[PDB]
Paper text:
The enzyme responsible for 2′-O-methylation at the 34 nt wobble position of the isoacceptors and in [name] was recently identified by mass spectrometry and designated [name]. Our results demontrate that the minimalist [name] Mtase EcTrmL functions as a homodimer by engaging residues from both subunits to bind [name]. The overall structure of an EcTrmL monomer subunit is composed of six β-strands and six α-helices, in the order β1-α1-β2-α2-α3-β3-α4-β4-β5-α5-β6-α6.
The SAH in subunit A is in the characteristic bent conformation already observed for SAH and SAM found in TtTrmH, HiYibk and TrmDs. In subunit B, a HEPES molecule from the crystal growth buffer is observed on top of SAH in the potential active site and is well stabilized with high density occupancy. From the chemical structure, the HEPES molecule is similar to the ribose and the phosphate group, which suggest that HEPES may mimic the U34 or C34 of the [name] substrate in this context. The HEPES molecule in subunit B is located in the same position as the homocysteine group of SAH in subunit A. This suggests that in subunit B, the structure is in a state in which the SAH and the [name] substrate are both bound.
Author numbering:
A (entry chain B): 0 to 154
B (entry chain A): 0 to 155
């Protein structure tokens, strides 16, 4: 299937490690927009317990513009606490790209402002909550989308 | 609301830190069955970026039997790769307790064998997948259950 997770300038290695495993366990495709806050090193990756098939599937983009041009996403959603519809309120479809920001910074306003409110998605939280852990946020979105499609590829 | 997450002998501090924040963000109640693989230290907790309201809400149980006796769960589910219904296949209700195993070991067979297959839940994964990260598995279950109830307590 054709669902895509995009990490914008991820900073914390274990978050990305968790996300690689997640996408491999679900068949989602993972994209990373450079620069990252860590070395992309096959050794550290296998070191973290990741198999080759898991991390070579990942595609790395030199920057946001390069990503758009390379991927030409059919639809692009941004996950942000400043979003409107819940992640379970959108109907995901093939060719969707779901974008997440860096741990300390979040997504730059410039990228957010170019998207319709309807494509900026907020995972619900209780009032006055602090942000979710990045890999947890990705997990929640991936599994909701996958559920919507009937867990294709899971037996 | 009354939904409960239970960690059985969690080993890896950051996993638990993530789960504390998750439960606080969602209004789920967190339970931990000792012994843990780390010191329960308010200083390290606030150190990790956790607020006081987040980690004092957590209830720690000396062991599994003490947990059952203290909590008397209306229904107890175990999350295991060896489970049957998907996490999205159960209808969660108030008084549910959802139990997760430790990172290196998983839940002991003794606990699993005492549960009906119908209460052993598997989060779907592609064939020949390796286990999920613990906090990611908890997040997925928490958000599915919360979704079923209409995200009560979240203002949308
Ligand atoms: N409730 C939520 N809804 C949507 N995205 C979320 C989210 N919580 C976290 N994220 C995602 O996770 C990323 C990193 S967390 C964002 C920064 C936040 N101020 C913090 O305290 O860490 C975000 O850029 C966003 O993509
Ligand atoms: N596919 C799945 N379905 C249900 N529970 C799962 C699961 N994958 C992991 N878990 C839960 O996560 C627990 C720990 S296995 C997770 C360890 C993970 N590799 C880590 O380092 O964090 C298991 O006991 C189980 O309760």
């Amino acid at each position: 299937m054709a669902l895509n997770i995009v990490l914008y300038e991820p900073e914390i290695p274990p978050n990305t490690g968790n996300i690689i495993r997640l996408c491999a366990n679900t068949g989602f495709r993972l994209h990373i927009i450079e620069p990252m806050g860590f070395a992309w090193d096959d050794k550290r990756l296998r070191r973290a317990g990741l198999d080759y098939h898991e991390f070579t599937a990942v595609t790395r983009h030199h920057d946001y513009r390069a990503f758009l041009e390379a991927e030409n996403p059919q639809r692009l959603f941004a996950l942000t606490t400043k979003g409107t519809p819940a992640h379970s309120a959108v109907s995901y479809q093939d060719g969707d790209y779901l974008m997440f920001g860096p741990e300390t910074r979040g997504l730059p306003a410039s990228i957010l402002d170019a998207l319709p409110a309807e494509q900026k998605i907020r995972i619900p939280m209780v009032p006055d909550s602090r942000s979710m852990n990045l890999s947890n946020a990705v997990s929640v979105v991936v599994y909701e989308a996958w559920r919507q499609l009937g867990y294709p590829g899971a037996v």
